[PDB]
Amino acid sequence: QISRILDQRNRQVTFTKRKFGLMKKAYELSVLCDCEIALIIFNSANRLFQYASTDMDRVLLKYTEYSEPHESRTNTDILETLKR
Amino acid sequence: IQISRILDQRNRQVTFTKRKFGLMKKAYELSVLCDCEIALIIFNSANRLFQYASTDMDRVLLKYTEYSEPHESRTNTDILETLKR
Lengths: 84, 85
Known about the structure:
The structure is a homodimer.
Chain A: H1 8-33, E1 36-42, E2 48-52, H2 56-65, E3 71-74, H3 75-83
Antiparallel strand pairs in A: 1-2
PDB class: transcription
Keywords: MEF2B, MEF2B Apo Structure, Self-regulatory protein
Assembly: dimeric
């Protein structure tokens, strides 16, 4: 029951609030549970925003070297889980 | 006050899973509400890789490599500084 915010002012304020919320939660997860986290966000104007718990090059390099299988989710899977 | 010692190691996995899912849920919401493309890469303390992409990971990482520099770049040091203000 969630949809896309059409009004550009209400889109930007919501984007900023939630982008910061995401980074705050990523920070918390990283310190609480000893995780390494990277977050890449392209907004609707195609502006790039990024967060990395350590630094981005480190996390992306680890990502590209990972030999073991990935556990991977997309919007389709998240939306399915949320229905339950 | 050593931040990594805060958590009870007994509930480590459950806390990790709950918060990982919270992060993905919020990423999903942001992507639909604000028309964003989002990728999330998480290595847990046992070095298990978990990933989320709103579209798919190869698409988001390719967009990343075709951009020259971030508009905002943050790490834990910056987030912690902002939170103190």
